[PDB]
Design an enzyme around this catalytic site. Structure first.
Site, PDB file in Angstrom:
ATOM      1  N   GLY A  86       0.804  -1.202   0.000  1.00 55.92           N
ATOM      2  CA  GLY A  86       0.000   0.000   0.000  1.00 55.92           C
ATOM      3  C   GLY A  86       0.843   1.261   0.000  1.00 55.92           C
ATOM      4  N   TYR A 127       2.814   4.564   1.189  1.00 58.00           N
ATOM      5  CA  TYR A 127       3.753   4.717   2.281  1.00 58.00           C
ATOM      6  C   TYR A 127       3.208   5.673   3.348  1.00 58.00           C
ATOM      7  CZ  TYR A 127       5.131   9.105   0.027  1.00 58.00           C
ATOM      8  OH  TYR A 127       5.128  10.363  -0.530  1.00 58.00           O
ATOM      9  N   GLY A 128       3.689   5.549   4.586  1.00 58.72           N
ATOM     10  CA  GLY A 128       3.277   6.397   5.692  1.00 58.72           C
ATOM     11  C   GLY A 128       1.924   6.069   6.307  1.00 58.72           C
ATOM     12  N   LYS A 142       1.806   0.474   7.771  1.00 57.14           N
ATOM     13  CA  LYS A 142       2.048  -0.924   7.428  1.00 57.14           C
ATOM     14  C   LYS A 142       3.269  -1.559   8.105  1.00 57.14           C
ATOM     15  CE  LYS A 142       4.278  -0.904   3.243  1.00 57.14           C
ATOM     16  NZ  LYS A 142       5.286  -0.330   4.189  1.00 57.14           N
ATOM     17  N   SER A 143       4.397  -0.860   8.150  1.00 54.96           N
ATOM     18  CA  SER A 143       5.612  -1.415   8.756  1.00 54.96           C
ATOM     19  C   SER A 143       5.452  -1.657  10.244  1.00 54.96           C
ATOM     20  CB  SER A 143       6.818  -0.498   8.551  1.00 54.96           C
ATOM     21  OG  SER A 143       7.333  -0.565   7.230  1.00 54.96           O
ATOM     22  N   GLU A 179      11.494  -3.785   5.285  1.00 58.43           N
ATOM     23  CA  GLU A 179      11.903  -3.036   4.106  1.00 58.43           C
ATOM     24  C   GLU A 179      13.387  -3.121   3.971  1.00 58.43           C
ATOM     25  OE1 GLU A 179       9.521  -2.110   2.161  1.00 58.43           O
ATOM     26  OE2 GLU A 179       8.578  -0.220   2.846  1.00 58.43           O
ATOM     27  N   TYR A 185      15.096  12.118  -5.092  1.00 61.53           N
ATOM     28  CA  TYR A 185      14.603  13.464  -4.813  1.00 61.53           C
ATOM     29  C   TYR A 185      15.650  14.544  -5.154  1.00 61.53           C
ATOM     30  N   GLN A 218      14.182   4.449  -9.747  1.00 63.61           N
ATOM     31  CA  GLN A 218      13.041   3.586  -9.509  1.00 63.61           C
ATOM     32  C   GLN A 218      13.435   2.119  -9.698  1.00 63.61           C
ATOM     33  OE1 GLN A 218       9.990   4.157  -7.988  1.00 63.61           O
ATOM     34  NE2 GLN A 218      10.335   1.933  -8.032  1.00 63.61           N
ATOM     35  N   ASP A 245       7.287  -7.155   4.080  1.00 60.55           N
ATOM     36  CA  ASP A 245       6.918  -5.767   3.894  1.00 60.55           C
ATOM     37  C   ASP A 245       7.047  -5.404   2.424  1.00 60.55           C
ATOM     38  OD1 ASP A 245       7.029  -3.003   6.059  1.00 60.55           O
ATOM     39  OD2 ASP A 245       6.759  -2.805   3.931  1.00 60.55           O
ATOM     40  N   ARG A 246       5.916  -5.461   1.725  1.00 62.05           N
ATOM     41  CA  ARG A 246       5.829  -5.167   0.289  1.00 62.05           C
ATOM     42  C   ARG A 246       6.152  -6.364  -0.595  1.00 62.05           C
ATOM     43  NH1 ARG A 246       4.136  -0.342  -0.562  1.00 62.05           N
ATOM     44  NH2 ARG A 246       4.787   1.544   0.568  1.00 62.05           N
ATOM     45  N   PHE A 256       4.572   1.915  -7.961  1.00 63.47           N
ATOM     46  CA  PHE A 256       5.297   3.163  -7.910  1.00 63.47           C
ATOM     47  C   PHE A 256       5.645   3.650  -9.316  1.00 63.47           C
ATOM     48  CE2 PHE A 256       6.261   4.678  -3.576  1.00 63.47           C
ATOM     49  CZ  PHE A 256       5.474   3.755  -2.884  1.00 63.47           C
ATOM     50  N   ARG A 285      -0.434  10.947  10.233  1.00 65.56           N
ATOM     51  CA  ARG A 285       0.718  10.086  10.466  1.00 65.56           C
ATOM     52  C   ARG A 285       1.936  10.658   9.733  1.00 65.56           C
ATOM     53  NH1 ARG A 285      -2.394   4.238  10.768  1.00 65.56           N
ATOM     54  NH2 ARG A 285      -3.742   4.894  12.523  1.00 65.56           N
ATOM     55  N   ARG A 344       5.975  11.263  11.814  1.00 61.26           N
ATOM     56  CA  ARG A 344       7.401  11.131  11.495  1.00 61.26           C
ATOM     57  C   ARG A 344       7.819  12.437  10.813  1.00 61.26           C
ATOM     58  NH1 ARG A 344       6.336   8.008   5.926  1.00 61.26           N
ATOM     59  NH2 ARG A 344       7.018  10.135   5.385  1.00 61.26           N
ATOM     60  N   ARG A 381       8.511  15.653  10.173  1.00 68.47           N
ATOM     61  CA  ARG A 381       8.863  16.746  11.111  1.00 68.47           C
ATOM     62  C   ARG A 381       9.698  17.930  10.576  1.00 68.47           C
ATOM     63  N   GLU A 420       9.473  20.010   6.481  1.00 68.15           N
ATOM     64  CA  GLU A 420       9.549  19.073   5.388  1.00 68.15           C
ATOM     65  C   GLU A 420       8.192  19.080   4.693  1.00 68.15           C
ATOM     66  OE1 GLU A 420      11.266  14.986   5.691  1.00 68.15           O
ATOM     67  OE2 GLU A 420      11.851  15.702   7.704  1.00 68.15           O
TER      68      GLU A 420
HETATM   69  C1  LIG Z   1       9.125   0.852  -2.433  1.00 67.86           C
HETATM   70  C2  LIG Z   1       9.369   2.221  -3.005  1.00 67.86           C
HETATM   71  C3  LIG Z   1       9.595   3.306  -2.176  1.00 67.86           C
HETATM   72  N1  LIG Z   1       9.795   4.530  -2.706  1.00 67.86           N
HETATM   73  C4  LIG Z   1      10.042   5.681  -1.815  1.00 67.86           C
HETATM   74  C5  LIG Z   1       8.773   6.451  -1.467  1.00 67.86           C
HETATM   75  C6  LIG Z   1       8.966   6.897  -0.018  1.00 67.86           C
HETATM   76  O1  LIG Z   1       9.248   8.289   0.052  1.00 67.86           O
HETATM   77  C7  LIG Z   1      10.137   6.083   0.519  1.00 67.86           C
HETATM   78  C8  LIG Z   1       9.776   5.332   1.789  1.00 67.86           C
HETATM   79  O2  LIG Z   1      10.200   3.968   1.774  1.00 67.86           O
HETATM   80  P1  LIG Z   1       9.619   2.969   2.906  1.00 67.86           P
HETATM   81  O3  LIG Z   1       8.174   2.701   2.539  1.00 67.86           O
HETATM   82  O4  LIG Z   1      10.558   1.793   3.109  1.00 67.86           O
HETATM   83  O5  LIG Z   1       9.803   3.912   4.204  1.00 67.86           O
HETATM   84  P2  LIG Z   1       8.640   4.702   4.979  1.00 67.86           P
HETATM   85  O6  LIG Z   1       8.548   6.105   4.418  1.00 67.86           O
HETATM   86  O7  LIG Z   1       8.959   4.504   6.446  1.00 67.86           O
HETATM   87  O8  LIG Z   1       7.246   3.967   4.611  1.00 67.86           O
HETATM   88  P3  LIG Z   1       6.715   2.578   5.270  1.00 67.86           P
HETATM   89  O9  LIG Z   1       6.826   1.451   4.264  1.00 67.86           O
HETATM   90  O10 LIG Z   1       7.334   2.385   6.640  1.00 67.86           O
HETATM   91  O11 LIG Z   1       5.153   2.911   5.405  1.00 67.86           O
HETATM   92  P4  LIG Z   1       4.434   2.580   6.781  1.00 67.86           P
HETATM   93  O12 LIG Z   1       3.133   3.321   6.808  1.00 67.86           O
HETATM   94  O13 LIG Z   1       4.466   1.085   6.863  1.00 67.86           O
HETATM   95  O14 LIG Z   1       5.408   3.268   7.864  1.00 67.86           O
HETATM   96  P5  LIG Z   1       5.037   3.409   9.427  1.00 67.86           P
HETATM   97  O15 LIG Z   1       6.268   3.919  10.149  1.00 67.86           O
HETATM   98  O16 LIG Z   1       4.440   2.091   9.873  1.00 67.86           O
HETATM   99  O17 LIG Z   1       3.862   4.526   9.512  1.00 67.86           O
HETATM  100  C9  LIG Z   1       4.108   5.925   9.730  1.00 67.86           C
HETATM  101  C10 LIG Z   1       3.763   6.468  11.130  1.00 67.86           C
HETATM  102  O18 LIG Z   1       2.415   6.186  11.569  1.00 67.86           O
HETATM  103  C11 LIG Z   1       2.410   5.743  12.943  1.00 67.86           C
HETATM  104  N2  LIG Z   1       1.513   4.568  13.037  1.00 67.86           N
HETATM  105  C12 LIG Z   1       1.582   3.319  12.507  1.00 67.86           C
HETATM  106  N3  LIG Z   1       0.483   2.556  12.844  1.00 67.86           N
HETATM  107  C13 LIG Z   1      -0.259   3.432  13.609  1.00 67.86           C
HETATM  108  C14 LIG Z   1      -1.473   3.259  14.244  1.00 67.86           C
HETATM  109  N4  LIG Z   1      -2.069   2.046  14.117  1.00 67.86           N
HETATM  110  N5  LIG Z   1      -2.011   4.295  14.953  1.00 67.86           N
HETATM  111  C15 LIG Z   1      -1.343   5.469  15.019  1.00 67.86           C
HETATM  112  N6  LIG Z   1      -0.152   5.647  14.400  1.00 67.86           N
HETATM  113  C16 LIG Z   1       0.376   4.619  13.705  1.00 67.86           C
HETATM  114  C17 LIG Z   1       3.841   5.305  13.262  1.00 67.86           C
HETATM  115  O19 LIG Z   1       4.215   5.727  14.567  1.00 67.86           O
HETATM  116  C18 LIG Z   1       4.717   5.962  12.207  1.00 67.86           C
HETATM  117  O20 LIG Z   1       5.375   7.102  12.752  1.00 67.86           O
HETATM  118  O21 LIG Z   1      10.627   5.272  -0.562  1.00 67.86           O
HETATM  119  C19 LIG Z   1       9.800   4.720  -4.111  1.00 67.86           C
HETATM  120  O22 LIG Z   1      10.000   5.844  -4.612  1.00 67.86           O
HETATM  121  N7  LIG Z   1       9.582   3.689  -4.950  1.00 67.86           N
HETATM  122  C20 LIG Z   1       9.366   2.457  -4.463  1.00 67.86           C
HETATM  123  O23 LIG Z   1       9.165   1.471  -5.311  1.00 67.86           O
END
Ligand SMILES: Cc1cn([C@H]2C[C@H](O)[C@@H](COP(=O)(O)OP(=O)(O)OP(=O)(O)OP(=O)(O)OP(=O)(O)OC[C@H]3O[C@@H](n4cnc5c(N)ncnc54)[C@H](O)[C@@H]3O)O2)c(=O)[nH]c1=O
Ligand SMILES: Cc1cn([C@H]2C[C@H](O)[C@@H](COP(=O)(O)OP(=O)(O)OP(=O)(O)OP(=O)(O)OP(=O)(O)OC[C@H]3O[C@@H](n4cnc5c(N)ncnc54)[C@H](O)[C@@H]3O)O2)c(=O)[nH]c1=O
Lengths: 331, 333
Positions: free
Chosen positions: B13, B15-16, B19-20, B41, B59, B83, B119-120, B129, B173, B177, B179, B182
């Protein structure tokens, strides 16, 4: 009605004669049994999209020299067009793969069908990438990126790496393009990479894996790299050392940890390469004689090659795929 | 020779979304269920393991675009290259673990011996993407095809869970992160959200037993408008009875890939076939993450009755445990 298909991937350094060769093998002029030829996807590369990727590659090795594009950046822009070369091969491979069938055996016989593919995915996912990397035109990281996309060869594939003495190879490279610079290092390195590739399949057939004799092997640095650009540096070997094969180039600091051990994730990649190249029964062919002769040289190692057992719908489907491929990859 | 029941889940799904964090909880024993290994990841691969950090780079090259010092022509080439760099660690992991899942994929409605949360899925970086970058004009359709083609075939038994979230909460959300001044980049986020809906709809369409051809020659040739609409927030949703228009296939009906007669070239139909085939071993589900980490972990969990399982052996299960341990170490920070 079951059908016995033998598929040949003709491969090797460019300008050697291989396309004339398969094109002759296919044409009604050779005799034997039905022989279908899958040509190079020229159209895909040149006319089917806004950008012509061959014309783009060299256009960037020009720019990178002509003091006008970051040397760092042409290593990315070129990496990219290298990616674009792969696409049509992967598409072809995906479409044809269901249809070759199973029960791969060395039957000794003549097959009801013979397919000749101009180049195997290995050429643009491993071989050309590997060469651009050895030339410093592309990073390890970037080579990894491409190598990772090589598909698993299904059972029964046969790859014939075509060879030619260097003298004659230079004569045929002038007859085709002049004005523009031939790039004698790319040719020298590609010649070496293709020997390395051949050595690699022989390595695997001999029952070894990439871990065998890995510790002993020297790390592979500027010295080792430069050596792959020299002509004759490598050659066919039925009993190769590890260092004679493609795996040797992956032992570099880039992929090694603080104490000289390759990272587990990187071992995984080397593992996948070895897996993917395993159903590839390897042969060589020297393309010295006339197109007709070359053809009969390839056709002569037919009794040695791997045949599969296909159903009569798929046979038909491959022939359609043949017609269409020649048609759309046109020019 | 001892038979182990595995169920693998690919969490995917936008990002942000959470899921992680969700996956880490599913791994944690506190969340009960069946023993869970979690492949995170491939961060290290992207950032630290090589001279260039694909996240910086990318970027930093979109920046030199608007901010004169590098060509608009090159950006859509260096960005594409980057990419492509995202996908590598996923392809590598996929190749390593695929020959360990074993066969006999059969929705068995019971708890499995074990559970793998990845994860993914490779689909994220080879289709989703890339598709979004193309819809935003940052990347050509031809570059897209160069990546779509590098989706690996999913073997039997794969389950993918596309995580979702209402936009308010998702943005909240994202700022949690990040902050301090940005920017977020709503534009991409909106398109990615639409792409993932297209994907859930795609696999539905396909499990439904429809092909990409059904309804194709009567679908509006997708071009200018279609790209705008793909980038507009909530233009797309999870359809109950999805049609071609709702799927990922729709975006490939462009002039770029037809002849003078308006007919898709056969080589392009092939690329379309491949993708349809790989997208046929994925059992698709959607999960909402508005709850708390635990709630989320439970939402994905409760699906398990619906998910499909493969039969592996003990020695294979045990290499996955290493595989997971290794991957986790080598990828942290
Ligand atoms: C795979 C791919 C990535 N990218 C680029 C795009 C992006 O800019 C960057 C991020 O790469 P990443 O996805 O490994 O790193 P993250 O930015 O950390 O994204 P995640 O995969 O971690 O997404 P998540 O949503 O799983 O991350 P998560 O940390 O779990 O969620 C964000 C915040 O929400 C809070 N949270 C999480 N669950 C919560 C809940 N249930 N209730 C309240 N808050 C909750 C957490 O504390 C966290 O701070 O990489 C590309 O350009 N092309 C690609 O093909
Ligand atoms: C796959 C790949 C290619 N490229 C680049 C490298 C190249 O610059 C360019 C075109 O490469 P191509 O392979 O698509 O097409 P060609 O440049 O034509 O090279 P071929 O692969 O076709 O090599 P061949 O030797 O098979 O081609 P052929 O035309 O048969 O040989 C060339 C000449 O030799 C003569 N010839 C052929 N057989 C002869 C014979 N038996 N006796 C005498 N002459 C013979 C013919 O007159 C022809 O003019 O693309 C990349 O950068 N990355 C990649 O991953």
């Amino acid at each position: 009605h079951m059908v016995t298909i033998v598929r040949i991937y003709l491969d090797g350094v460019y300008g050697i004669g291989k396309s004339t060769t398969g094109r002759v093998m296919a044409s009604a002029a050779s005799g034997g049994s039905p022989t279908l030829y899958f040509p190079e996807p020229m159209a895909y590369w040149r006319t089917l999209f806004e950008t012509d990727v061959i014309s783009g590659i060299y256009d960037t090795q020009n720019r990178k020299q002509q003091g006008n594009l970051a040397v760092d950046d042409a290593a990315l822009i070129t990496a990219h067009y290298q990616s674009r070369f792969t696409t049509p091969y992967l598409i072809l491979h995906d479409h044809t793969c269901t249809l070759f069938g199973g029960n791969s055996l060395q039957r000794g016989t003549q097959p009801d069908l013979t397919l000749v593919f101009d180049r195997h995915p290995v050429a643009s996912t491993v071989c050309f990438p590997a060469a651009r990397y050895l030339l410093g035109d592309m990073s390890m990281c970037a080579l990894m990126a491409m190598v990772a996309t090589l598909p698993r060869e299904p059972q029964g594939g046969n790859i014939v790496v075509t060879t030619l003495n260097v003298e004659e190879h230079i004569r045929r490279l002038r007859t085709r393009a002049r004005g523009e610079q031939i790039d004698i290092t790319l040719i020298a390195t590609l010649r070496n990479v293709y020997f390395m590739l051949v050595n690699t399949c022989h390595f695997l057939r001999s029952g070894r894996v990439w871990r065998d004799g890995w510790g002993e092997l020297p790390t592979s640095c500027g010295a080792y790299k430069h050596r792959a650009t020299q002509m004759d540096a490598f050659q066919e070997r039925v009993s190769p050392e590890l260092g004679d094969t493609l795996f040797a180039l992956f032992k570099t600091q880039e992929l090694l940890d603080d104490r000289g051990v390759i990272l587990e994730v990187h071992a995984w990649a080397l593992d996948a390469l070895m897996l993917k190249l395993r159903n590839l029964n390897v042969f060589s062919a020297d393309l010295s004689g006339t197109p007709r002769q070359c053809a009969a040289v390839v056709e002569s190692l037919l009794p040695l090659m791997s045949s599969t057992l296909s159903d009569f719908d798929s046979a038909s489907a491959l022939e359609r795929a043949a017609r269409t491929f020649n048609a759309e990859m046109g020019v």
